[PDB]
Every structure is written in C-alpha cells, then in structure tokens.
Amino acid sequence: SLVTQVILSADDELRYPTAGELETISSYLKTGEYRIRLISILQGKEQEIIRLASKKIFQLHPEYIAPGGNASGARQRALCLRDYGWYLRLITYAILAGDKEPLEKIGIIGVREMYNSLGVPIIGMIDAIKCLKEATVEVISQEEEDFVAPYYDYIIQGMS
Amino acid sequence: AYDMDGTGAGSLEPRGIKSSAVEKDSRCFKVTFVLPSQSRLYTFRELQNVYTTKMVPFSSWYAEQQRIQKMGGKILKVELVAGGQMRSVGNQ
Amino acid sequence: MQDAITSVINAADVQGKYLDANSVEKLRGYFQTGELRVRAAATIAANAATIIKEAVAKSLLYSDITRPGGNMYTTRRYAACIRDLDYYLRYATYGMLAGDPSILDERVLNGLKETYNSLGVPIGATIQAIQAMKEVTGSLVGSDAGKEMGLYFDYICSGLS
Amino acid sequence: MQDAITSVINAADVQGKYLDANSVEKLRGYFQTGELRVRAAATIAANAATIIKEAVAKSLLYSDITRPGGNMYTTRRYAACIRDLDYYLRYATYGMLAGDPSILDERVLNGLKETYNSLGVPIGATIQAIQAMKEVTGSLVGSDAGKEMGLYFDYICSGLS
Amino acid sequence: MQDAITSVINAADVQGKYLDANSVEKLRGYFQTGELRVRAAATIAANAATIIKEAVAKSLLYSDITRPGGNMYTTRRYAACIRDLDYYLRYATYGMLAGDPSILDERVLNGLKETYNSLGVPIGATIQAIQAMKEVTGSLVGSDAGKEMGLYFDYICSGLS
Amino acid sequence: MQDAITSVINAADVQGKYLDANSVEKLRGYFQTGELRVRAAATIAANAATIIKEAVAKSLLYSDITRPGGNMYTTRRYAACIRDLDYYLRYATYGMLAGDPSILDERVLNGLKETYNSLGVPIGATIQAIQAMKEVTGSLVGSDAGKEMGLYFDYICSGLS
Amino acid sequence: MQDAITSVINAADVQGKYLDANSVEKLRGYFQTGELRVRAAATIAANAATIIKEAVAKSLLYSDITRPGGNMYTTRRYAACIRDLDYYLRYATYGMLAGDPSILDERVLNGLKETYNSLGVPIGATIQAIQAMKEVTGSLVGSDAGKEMGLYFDYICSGLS
Amino acid sequence: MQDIITSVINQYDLSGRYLDIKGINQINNYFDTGLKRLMIAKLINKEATNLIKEASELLFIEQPELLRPCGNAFIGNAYTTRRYAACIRDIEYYLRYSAYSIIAGNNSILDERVLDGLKETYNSLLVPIGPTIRVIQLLKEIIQKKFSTENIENAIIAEPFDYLAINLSDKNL
Amino acid sequence: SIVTKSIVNADAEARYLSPGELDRIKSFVLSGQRRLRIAQTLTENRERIVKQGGQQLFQRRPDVVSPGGNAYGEEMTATCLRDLDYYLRLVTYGIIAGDVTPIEEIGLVGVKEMYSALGTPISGVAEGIRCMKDVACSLLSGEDAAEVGFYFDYTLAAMQ
Amino acid sequence: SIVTKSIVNADAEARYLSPGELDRIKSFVLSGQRRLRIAQTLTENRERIVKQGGQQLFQRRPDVVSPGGNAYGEEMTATCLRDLDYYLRLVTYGIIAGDVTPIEEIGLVGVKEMYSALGTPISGVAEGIRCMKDVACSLLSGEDAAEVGFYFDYTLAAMQ
Amino acid sequence: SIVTKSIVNADAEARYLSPGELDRIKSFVLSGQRRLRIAQTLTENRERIVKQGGQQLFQRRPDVVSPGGNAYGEEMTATCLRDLDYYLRLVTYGIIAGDVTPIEEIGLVGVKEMYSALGTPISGVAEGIRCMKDVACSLLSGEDAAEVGFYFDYTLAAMQ
Ligand SMILES: CCC1=C(C)/C(=C/C2=NC(=C\c3[nH]c(/C=C4\NC(=O)[C@H](C)[C@H]4CC)c(C)c3CCC(=O)O)/C(CCC(=O)O)=C2C)NC1=O
Ligand SMILES: CCC1=C(C)/C(=C/C2=NC(=C\c3[nH]c(/C=C4\NC(=O)[C@H](C)[C@H]4CC)c(C)c3CCC(=O)O)/C(CCC(=O)O)=C2C)NC1=O
C-alpha cells in the first residue's frame, strides 16, 4: 500500500517517517471508505464490462479471431476473456491500495516476455486495456471515472 | 578509526550502519543465505548463483545482514568461527 | 513487507477473487485505527531516547551484567546494546504503523537468535529489556496505542525466545 | 570444464603415460562425431526461442501452476522460468559440443536443488519441462544429435531430482 | 589474537581485579624470555626457505606422494604445498613471539581440516612434514627456542589431526 | 611522503653516493629534535578540539561570515569548516613529526585552491583562521615547538594563497 | 621549434658527444628528402585555397552543421572555420618542411582542445575535415609527399582527439 | 532540484528574514494553478505514446535528410533502426522531464537533470541540435492543441519547452 | 517540499509520477491556503513565542544562565534567543513547504557537530524548542496546533 | 599490546616481522620492569588519586553536583568516583601493555554513545580525567610522570 | 623510514599517532647514533666487502664466470661487482632508515623481472649477497653484526 511505500523509503534511510510522510499516510487512510465502495461498484458490473470490451477489442482487430489469429478458436477466446477478468481484479486491488504496486508486481513487469512467449501481440494487449478502460468508464459515474482513469493509463504506459 | 566515535543523528556525516567492531577486529562469521535479485527482469543482466556460503568480517556483518534483509533474502545459518566470546581486550 | 492492506489484497488475489464484504470489513477496521496509529508513531519518534534510557534504567542498569564479566561491561558493549534497543523500538513502530508484523520477520527476527548465540548475548536479559521498553512505550502513548505496540513487542520477544 | 579431449589427456597425464591405443580410440571417436555436433549446435542456436515456446506450451502452459497460487503465476515468475529454460538449453548445447557433462556440474547443477527448495520452485514440473524440451530438440536436430542432446538433458534431470 | 600480556590482563579484567602477585609472576616470566624469543624469531626469518627445503627433503620428496597419482604430483600441487609449509612456519613464529597460540586458532586451524578433507590432501603426510620442520627449526635455533617453537608446532599438528 | 631521513637518503642515493659528513650533520640535527617533536605532537593530540574552538572564537566567530549570507551560515557549513580546520591541524602535526612538508603537498594542498574557488569558500578568512590556530598551538606547545609548528602552518597558508 | 637537424644536434649535445655515425645517418636521410619536401611545399602553397574548398565540399559542406543550429551556420562561423582550416594546412606544411612536428605542439595543439570545448566547436567534424584535406593534399602532391604531409595531418588529428 | 516554493523560501533564507506578503503572494500564485497543472500532467500521461509518434512524424516530414545516410560526416541522425530507436528514446526523455517541470512550476529540474552536460554529449556524438529543438517545440504545439482557449494553461505548457529551446540554442544575435 | 521529494523519488526509478503521487500533490496544493494562514499566525507572533519560550527554558535549565553557563551574560542570552528565533523561522518554512526538508537541510544536518564545537549543551536547545512548541501551540486551534506541533516534534527528535 | 599490534600489522602484509619490529619488541621487553614499577605506584595509590581528582572536578564543575546535576546526591557522586576508578585502572593496563589498546578497546570505543544515553556530560568526564592526571603525575618522577601522562592525554583526546 | 611508516599507518585510520607509535619513534631517534656508527663501518669498508664477497661467490658458483656464463669476461665481472656494490649501499641506507623501505623500494620491487630480462640467474645474486653478509658481519661486534645481518637476510628472502 501507500503505508508500505512510506515505511520502506523511511527504513532504507534508517529513520522514522517525517511529517510529510506521516500526513501522506493520514490522508490515504482517510480515503479508505470511498475506495472501499468504488470497488464494490466495479465488482458489481464486471460481467458487463468484460462483455462489451471484448466485442470492442475484436471490432478493432478482427484478424486476431480470424483463421490464423492467436485467439481464433473457442478455447483461446475464453482465455482472453479470462485475462480481462484478471486485469479487472488487479485494478480493484490497485484502487484499494491507492497506488500502482499490485498492478506492477503482478501484471506489468515481465508481461511483454510472457506475451511474446505465447504469441499474443503487444499492440493488441495495449489496445485491449484501452477498450477495457472505455467499457468501464461507459458504465460508471464521472467522478468515479475521474478516480479510476490514472490506474488504466499506468497499465497502458507499463506495457509500452 | 572505528564506527562508534559518537556519530548519530544530527551529525555532518549521513546516517548509516554503525558496527561495534573494535578497530582492526579479526573476528569473523560464517554465513549461509539466499538472495534472489528481484531486479533482473527489467535490467536483463545475466544470472548469478544466489546461494552463498562465505566468511564475513565481524566489522561488516551487521551492515551485510541488513543489506541481505533489505533485498528480500533469507539467512539460513550463522556461526562465529574466529575470535573469543566476551573477551575484553584481544579482539584486534 | 506487507501491511494490512497488502495482506488483504494478497488474500483476495491468490484466489482470483474480487474484494468482497470480509475484505471491506478488514479494510474499514484498518482505516478507522490509522489516525491513532499515526499519533502513536509521532509520539514515539518524539521520545525514543528517553524511552530507551528509562527501560535500561529499570531493567538492567544496576544488575551484574553491567559489571566486569557481564555481557555489557565495556563501553563498546553498552553502546552496542543501546543501539540494539533502538533497532527494536524503531521496527516495532514500523510494524505498528503497517498493522502487520511481516517486516519484523524479514528485517529483524531472521537469524537473530543465531547471531546472539554466536556472540554470547543473554537472551533472557534482552527479552526483559524489551518488556521494560513495552511498559514505558504503552505508558507514553496511552492504552490503545500501548496495546497495539505491545502486540509487536511481544511478537519480537516470542521470535527471540 | 573439460571436454572429451581434455578428459583423455588428463587420464593419460595422471599416470605419467603417453597417449596409447585406447586414447587414440576415444580421440578418433570424438573427432568423427564433431561435425555432427557442430551442425546440431548451429541448428539449436537457430531455434532456441521456438523450442522453449513449444516445450512450455506442451508441458505446463495450461496447467494449474500458471493460475493464481501456482508457482509461475505473476509475470515476474513466468519470465524467470522461461529464462531458466533458456539456461538449460544453452548449457545442454555446450555439453553436447564438448562431449562432456562437467560444465553442467560446475556451472548449472552445483547448488541448484537447494536454490529451488529455498525458493519453493516445484522440481517435478521443472523436470517435466526439461523432458518436453528434449522432445522438441531431438525432433528438430534428428535422431543422432537428438540422442546426444538427450544424454545431457537426462543428466540435468538426474542432477535435479 | 591475544599474547601472554593480553591474556593476563584479560584474566584480571574479567573479574574486576587489579593485577596481583600471580599476574606479576606470569608477566615477569614472559619478560624474561622475550629476548630469547626475539633472537629465535630473527634467526627463523633468516632461514625460512632452507628450513622448508630441508624438511621437505627429509619428509616427503622421492616417495609415492610426489609421483604420478600422489597429491602434490604436478607443479601446481608442489608449489601449493610448499606455500602451505611456509604458512605454518610463519604462524608458528608469530605464536612463539606472542607466547600464546590463539593466533593459530583464529588464523590457521579454523576450518583447515575441512578444507584439506574437501581437497583430498593427506593429513598424516602434512603432520609428518610439520614434524620434520620442527626438527630443523629446533636444530637451527638451539634447545630452549626449539622447545618453544615445538610447542606451537605440536599445537598445529594436534589441531590438524 | 618523505621525512627528513628519507629526503637525506634520497639526496644521497640520487648521486650514487654514500652518506657523507653533511648527511650525518642533517641526520644528527633531526635526531636531536625528535624528542621535542614527539612531546609537541602528544600535547597537540591532547588539545585539538580546544585549539580549534579557541582559534574559531578569536578569528571568525562573531564576524559577518557566520551571519545570513556569509560563507558558513547554516549548520552544514559551520560543521564543514570546523572539520577543515581539524584537517589542517592534523596534517600540520604530521608534517612537524616528519620534519618535511611533502605530506602537505601530496595530501592537502594538491587542488585545494581550485576546490575552494569552485565552492566559493573565502581564502582570506581561511588563512586568517589558520593564523589564529598557529597562535594557540604555539601558545600551548611552547616556543621551540611553536616555531616548528608555525613553519608548516605558514607553509599551508602560502600554498593556499 | 626544432627541425630534424636541430633535433639530431640536440640529442648529440645533451650527451657531450660529437656527431657519430648514427647522427650522420639521420642527417643524410633528411638531406636526401629535402628537395622533395621543397617541391611539395611549393605545390601546396600554390593551391591552398582550392585544397580547402574541395575538402570543405567533400566533408561538411551539405551536412546539417551548416544549417540553422549547426556550428558553422552564420557567415562569421563559416569564415572562422575556413580560416582554421587554412591554419592547419599552413602549419602542416611548416612541419613537413622541418621534418619535425614540434612546431605543431608549440604553435597549434597547445590549448586547442580546451578552446574548442569552451567555444562548443565539434571535434569530430574538425578531425574529419582535416582527414578530407589530407586526401586532397596527398592527391595533389603525389604519393611520397602525400605520406609525408599525412604524417603531420594525423599528428594534428591525434593531438585534437 | 527546487520547486517554486523551495526557491522562494531559499531566496528568503538568503537574507535571513521571515516570509512577507510579497513571497506569500508568489506562493499563492502557484497554489491557485496547481490543480490545472495536475490536469495537464494527467493528460500528458494519458497521451504520451501518441504525442511522441505525432511529433516524430512531423519532424521527419520536414527534415527528410535526418532519415538518409549520414553523409561522410559521421553525423548521428536517425539513419538506421538503432539510431532511430535512440532518437525516439530522447523524445520520450524531453516529454517526461518537461512534465516534471510543469508539475513543479519551475525549470530547475530541467537545467539540473537535462541541460547540464547535454551539449557536450551531443557534440561528442555529433547529434543534430537544430532538429532536436525543432521536435521539442513541435511537441509543445501538439500539447497546446488540447488546451487552446484556456490561455493560462497555454502559458503553463509553453514554459518548459521554451526554456529548453532557448537553452539548447546558440546565440547568433 | 512535497512536490520536490515526490519528483526525486520518481526520478530515481526512471518513471513518471504514479497517480498516488499526483493525488498527494493535488491534496497539498489544495491545503496550501490554510498552510499559509498557519504560517501567518506563527510568523507574526514571533516576539511572544521567543520570549515565553526563553522564560520556560531558563526556569527549567537555570544552569545555562547561571554564572559561567554557556548563555551567561546579556550577550549570550541574546544569542540564545537569536537561535530560538532561527528555529521558529525554520518551522514556518517547513509548515509552508509541507515537509521537514527546509528544517532538516537548514539547521538539522550537522547540528550536533556545531553545538559541540561551540560548547553549547544540545539538551538545552531541545528544551528551548519544546517550550516554544507549547507557547506556539497555545495560540492555535486544535487541528492547527496538532499539525503545527508535528514539526516541533521532528525538530526535537533530530536534536536529541 | 605492542607485540600484538606488530604481529597483526605484519600479518596483513603476509610477511615475517622485519628487524625494526623485532628491535622494538626487544626494547619493550627490556623496559617491562620499569613499566611494572610505574604501574605499581599508580595502582596502589588509587584512593588518593580518585579522591583528589574528584575534588578538582567538583570545584571546576560545580554544576554536575549542584542540585539536579547528573552526579547530584550521594549515590550519583559515588558512581562518578566509580567511573574515575575505572579509568585509572584502564590507564594502569595501558601502561603495562605499552600501548593504548587496552584503554581504547575497553572504555573508549563507543564512550560518547554510552554517556549520551546516560545523560552524562562527556566534558565533565574529561575534566575528571585531567584532574586525576595532574594528581597522579604529582607522585612520579620527571621522566616517569612524562611517560604516564602520555596515556591520560590520549584518553582525554579520545573523550573530546 | 620508521617514522614515515608509522605516519602512513596512522593516516589510513584517520587518527593521531597512539602512544605506542610515539614510543617507538622515540626509541628510534635515541638509537640513531649507533645506527650512524654502524653505517659508517659498513660504508667505509666497501672495497674489502665487495671483493671478498665476489670471491666467495665465484668459488661457490664457478658457472657464472665460466666460459660463456652471464658474468664471463672482464666487463661482465666488473658489472657483477657493481651490482654487489649497489646492494651494499642499499643495505647501509636501510640501516640508517631503521627499516627495509629504502632497500625494498630501490632494488627489490621488480628485481625478478629485471634479472630475468637481463638473463642473470637470481640465485647467483642471492649467493653473492650471502657472501657479502658473512664478510661484513665478520667486521662487526656481536650485537652489531646481529642487527646488520638482519637486513641482509631480508634482501635474501626477497631475492629467492
Ligand atoms: C535489525 C535487527 C538486528 C539486531 C537486533 C542486530 C544485532 C547485533 N548485535 C550485535 C552485538 C551486540 N549486541 C549486544 C546486546 C546486548 N547485550 C546485553 O547484555 C543485552 C541483553 C543486549 C542489549 C539489550 C552487545 C553487548 C553486542 C556486542 C558483542 C561484542 O562486542 O562482542 C551485532 C554484532 C555487530 C557488531 O556490533 O559489530 C549484531 C549484528 N543486528 C540486526 O540486524
Ligand atoms: C545456470 C544455472 C542456474 C539456474 C537454473 C538458476 C535459477 C534461479 N531461478 C530463480 C528463480 C525462479 N525460477 C523459476 C522457475 C520455475 N517455475 C516453475 O514453476 C517452473 C517449474 C520453473 C521453470 C521451468 C521461478 C518462477 C523463479 C522466481 C521465484 C520468485 O520470484 O520467487 C533464481 C532467483 C533469482 C531471481 O530471479 O531473482 C535463480 C538464481 N540460477 C542458476 O545459476
């Protein structure tokens, strides 16, 4: 969490957390209930978000599901949708601990190597996370969209 | 000369690890530990054996153990192999 | 290291689950006590030297271990042990802020008993000094923060014994 | 490291002997297969990434170890394991060129089981991935070179088990 | 390391005592023999190479260990063993000057048997070579200094066996 | 570094000469003053902190350089300059013991003016602080040792100007 | 400056020697090539402007350094750089006539890199322009004189790099 | 580095005086634009790849010689794939550090972590400095096309790129 | 400054500021107005704060102004009050910066060396700072006094 | 000990003791008898030395025994005299060892940390050691007092 | 020089000279007079020392002056005696310096490389030095000869 980051940067210098870091922790801990409801909202609508983002991603890249693509076939498409679900779950974790650490430890670091290993193009992955952000913002509030967008953009930058 | 010459908070020298080792100490530990790199997957450097058994000087064992704990490593065994125990003069 | 939030997120992520009502329960529990935790951490940072001084004075200052032959006789050994007590207090404060003793396992207790046994440091006297420090710290921070801090003090003492 | 030539010379030198008819027998044996060895090493260098990809796809790609909770779940762990498989393939190629598995003992197997046990890496799945890599490699290089490469693949698997 | 003076001071300091008549007895004993010790150390520094050469010639040179199959057969091994004998002689001289074998425990004997066992170095032949070196050294330095040096030579041999 | 003895030996060796009467003259001159040099060095080691404190108090303690805008206003700068004065005193003591200012050239004055100019440290105030330190040091060690120490103090001031 | 004759005379005079057979060897060597040197110097004096024009045209005339932002963009900078190239050609001719590059050290290379670094003049482009001038000059004066001139051109480029 | 608050506080510490209404007005100036500075930072983080692709294309359309052989003058331009990747990396560098500078309200991060030593490196590598500034102000225009009528955000965007352009330049006049 | 420290901590890792750091910068620029108000109140009541802190110090530590003490005499007492004014000014700087960087970079790094070279007992300076803290917190509201003493406590901890 | 230090300094370089080091060991063992005599004289006059040093300290530093001072009260004064006795014993050890290794390894390494943790002013301990030095040198001859104060001066320098 | 070496060994540790090092410097400056006397005796008897050492060498090693040996001929024998004179001069330097620094810095560092490049057997040089040692120690007293051979032995050890 942010608490962990503050503690780690304070421990690496062999000191107690300064005043500014302590108020970082304070302000974050006062934000807890808002995030703890927002992930309620987003977990409520996952089955819809994934369903629409999936049709978007293949309207943009129809050759992925065409004969010869990486996702052509029932088994492959099911697992792309599963990847959608996993990334939405990671985004809920990231919104909970109010910074990028789950999205980085799981997800971003080493992801290009895994996808090059599997045969999924990386530009398709970037566009899929874009379509996911699209689908999620289409079904939530404007204040909630304001709160959730930077987490998607961090993923988009961490893949590229 | 030695690490415990009065330096603490508010010194000119930055805050750091302070060994209690008497100057020119000759006490030595024998330690076994594992230390995964946890940075190789974005620097892309070649691998190295992370399982180590070595002798470390008493004057550097504390900073060494704290560095090992910083980077996620696990310490499997420690042994003082050189030097007495609770010897007042004669650690040099 | 993982705090309470990291532990909840890990428990949820290791099952492919979204954060359900029990995770929200634990997260609210941590968020309600965070401000008390920050207050206690500030107060402890304020008075670390006096806490260590008073604990040493009440626990082992006039015993036989500080006399010739004792573990902490010479000035080197006295300074080393007060530095050790400072370590224990600082890491207990970290654990109290995080709400999770994993930092104590990773950075303090890992290979500590073996180091003390190789050096000849008495474990019982160390545990008693930590217990005396627990008294002064709970005293200074009040009942709730003192129970929180005593949790991690007792964690260190159990890992050392 | 010592290759077949180095091993023969060492066996002869450790007795104060000149290279007699049996040493000539072994040396001719190595010299006859050297060209096949070079061909196989070139072909394996050509297709290392595809070999590793196909072995991973046939051995552990859709099993439960790649799901949450499994060893290689996160992206860090996936990348680390494919790097490990690349290590195994490269060192097996070195051993096949040298005609002697001593490089595997000195640079690979020394303290590998202990590292994997401390990390929690499943040994059986690793041995099965190496076995799948043996299939693809023998497939790509043909029967004789595949038996040569499988010798050192099985050497690694026996040293790991 | 601690010499005779350091050991006496430590024995007195570990009890909170001032140096009484027995400490004075031991200190006078060391101070009376110090000049003989310096003479012997100078003479041994003068003739180290010849001492090692003569000990090796009388103990193990035209035997089976220097022939093919023997430990020190090759030139690497011969040089390594003569370097080892030089180490033993130099550290025995240090111990004789200090009047205390603690330097031998800290700098020589700690983990030596285990190193020799892992390398395959024969312990009996090493002890025999050290015994031959004791003869030549006592020969060169005379009876009293030879007894002094033989004390630490036998200390090394007992720590090695 | 080279002391008086090293300098005499070098002057004699650079000509293929044996040490003749003039070398003996210089060597006797150094040997006669060595004991006074040791006395002065001991006394200066005894009172280094008080010497620096008194020199700073008499030279630049209440001037405008210690006020806002001055070259030693903040606590960092004050500590840095007192550390510099400690350096100067210690190296002047080394030079006085050696009887040769070559250590000052090699370890102190080499690139010092350039460092001070890049940092913006006022050279005149530094030279005046060194002059004040010369007063206190000669005061504490008496006339002859004070002239000896003032030789190297003036050497540092000339190398700095 | 010292030419070949001056250098030989200096080497002989710095030892109190008369000019022996080796000095005569070097002196004859210079005297045999002097006439070729005079021919080359005359031809180079004839065509200096065309040499510089052709070198600039082949090296940096249409590159990006002559466009806005480049080094030699404005007319001041273009004129300054062609003057620099004229300097280099004239001094290389002097060095070729003298048979000794000491004039280049004394009058050209002394503090040139520092001036170019303070001004911001690109060193690589300058070295490449000098290399292009070497081509044209060797072209115009023929093989032997071109090698002679290229010696000093490369001397300037090495002193500049 | 120093943000605007740190530099104002350092100017007041230099004379040893407390903050008066002038420095407090200077600090209020930053506190009143902080939120739109953060909006600009988030926009830059959302559009970084596309912004740099557009900037590189617009640079190479009008400086086509940057993609051709170096000419014998061993100039470091975007000739091959290696040099091309290096140049795009530099463009990302400039975007990142001027985003930092926009958030700080100051240009000290720029001259400490970008400008100090830049021209020495480029001269030793023979990298073109004209087109390098050209692409920086291209990036500036592309960013400014997102906030056009809001003039205050226009100046806030113009600050870092214009600092970089005026400091990488040579002074012909 | 919080912005500066966030920028350096993000710079070492070679990454842009994550949405957590930007969130915290936003919260800081939003609170800057009450930060300036609190700095106002502490700044323009400096005379009473220094005077009443000097009293509590001299009553708690009569030795420093006793005959021969470090602050013995008119000039030495004036110099000690000057030091207390220095530290109050640094506390105002830290309050407006949102972090103890101004206090620590000016007046805390190497303070033990300086006060040991001057012959001043550092515990007396700590006592003076504590007395000034009580006097200054007496003039603020509850939450304001809590946030303001946050920096006095750090200055005391660094000055042990 | 001089012998020990010579042995370690020769051990690091992997060489036997040169004739200079052996010369110095010889000179040391030859002077050991007067070293023991001087240690005798200092050792068995400990009561007067500690008493008269405590007096000169308390007259030079009345604050430490003033009401509330660190050594205020019967027990604290007894403890301070105990510390002075500790340091006199260490000086005798150093005199017999021929070098400050016993004094420095016992009582000097980390002395500032200990006395700061105890709340004791280190300058008072330095004053007490200086007073004991004068008292002890008063009972020796010229050359003996010179050689004996040689160690008090080192203890004072280390205790600044 | 002993003073120089003490100063460097104390300089690396960033400390003044302890009383042991000062004791040893004192003992050295006190013995400087007999050091100069011994250097006198060795210095001004150089002709006999070199001559008689050359004899003992040529009788112990007839191959070096045999037909074709390295020192074969008038000029080569003169050069070898020149080398022996070099080493006697260095031994006098070392005697007056109180330590083998002059001998080792001049004539010992890289001696094997030089004599291998010249084609000279280093064992012959060692034999010559041993013969000169016996001849020179024959002209000194017991303790003087012991102290003087102290340096010949070091030169022999370094020249193995
Ligand atoms: C961060 C977790 C952590 C701890 C706690 C730690 C302890 C640690 N304590 C040490 C020594 C020591 N520790 C003590 C402590 C004590 N003596 C007593 O009598 C008391 C019971 C006790 C204090 C309460 C003493 C006296 C020594 C010195 C041992 C010696 O000099 O021989 C040393 C040897 C290093 C040195 O001083 O040179 C280490 C590494 N290291 C770590 O990484
Ligand atoms: C040259 C010989 C050699 C080898 C082989 C080697 C292996 C090695 N594998 C490691 C980790 C690892 N290795 C794996 C491998 C696997 N996971 C699975 O499920 C599979 C069965 C298996 C791949 C086939 C994983 C997942 C990690 C990461 C462990 C972690 O991050 O906790 C690490 C820890 C270093 C780090 O990544 O920071 C080392 C040192 N080192 C060597 O010197």
Ligand SMILES: CCC1=C(C)/C(=C/C2=NC(=C\c3[nH]c(/C=C4\NC(=O)[C@H](C)[C@H]4CC)c(C)c3CCC(=O)O)/C(CCC(=O)O)=C2C)NC1=O
């Ligand atoms: C949390 C980090 C993380 C990720 C991302 C992850 C992915 C992952 N993706 C898989 C398959 C897959 N995933 C895809 C994905 C896609 N194809 C496309 O065209 C799209 C761009 C994309 C969907 C958005 C495909 C095509 C496969 C199967 C390819 C194959 O059959 O080899 C599998 C094997 C499933 C199993 O073993 O039961 C895993 C574990 N694991 C992780 O731990």
Ligand SMILES: CCC1=C(C)/C(=C/C2=NC(=C\c3[nH]c(/C=C4\NC(=O)[C@H](C)[C@H]4CC)c(C)c3CCC(=O)O)/C(CCC(=O)O)=C2C)NC1=O
């Ligand atoms: C200071 C105390 C100390 C000692 C003594 C020491 C010994 C030591 N002896 C070694 C080898 C050796 N030691 C010997 C010695 C012997 N062979 C015989 O037959 C004889 C009985 C004996 C000599 C008397 C040989 C032959 C080797 C080489 C082993 C090999 O090359 O495989 C090695 C391996 C290092 C290397 O040479 O690369 C060490 C570390 N290390 C120490 O720190």
Ligand SMILES: CCC1=C(C)/C(=C/C2=NC(=C\c3[nH]c(/C=C4\NC(=O)[C@H](C)[C@H]4CC)c(C)c3CCC(=O)O)/C(CCC(=O)O)=C2C)NC1=O
């Ligand atoms: C901005 C950070 C900063 C600080 C804090 C600072 C302190 C500082 N304190 C000084 C003196 C002094 N400071 C004191 C202070 C005290 N006496 C006591 O007993 C009390 C414990 C204490 C007052 C609370 C005294 C008495 C002097 C004069 C000492 C002398 O001249 O002998 C001096 C030398 C004269 C001068 O004021 O210019 C400096 C530079 N400089 C800085 O740049």
Ligand SMILES: CCC1=C(C)/C(=C/C2=NC(=C\c3[nH]c(/C=C4\NC(=O)[C@H](C)[C@H]4CC)c(C)c3CCC(=O)O)/C(CCC(=O)O)=C2C)NC1=O
């Ligand atoms: C010698 C090794 C080597 C190659 C080949 C290379 C190519 C290369 N092709 C480029 C662009 C381009 N290349 C192409 C087209 C193609 N490229 C092809 O190899 C196909 C024949 C064709 C597609 C059918 C296009 C259309 C662009 C414009 C880039 C864009 O706007 O996307 C660029 C960017 C600059 C430019 O526009 O010229 C490079 C550096 N660099 C190298 O160092």
Ligand SMILES: CCC1=C(C)/C(=C/C2=NC(=C\c3[nH]c(/C=C4\NC(=O)[C@H](C)[C@H]4CC)c(C)c3CCC(=O)O)/C(CCC(=O)O)=C2C)NC1=O
């Ligand atoms: C052998 C090296 C060595 C030393 C020096 C040493 C000192 C030492 N001094 C102590 C206390 C003390 N020391 C003093 C000393 C002083 N008060 C003053 O004002 C004066 C400046 C000074 C006397 C000159 C006082 C008052 C205490 C008791 C502090 C307290 O209990 O509050 C204590 C705690 C109680 C005890 O004596 O066991 C230790 C361990 N221990 C060692 O092993």
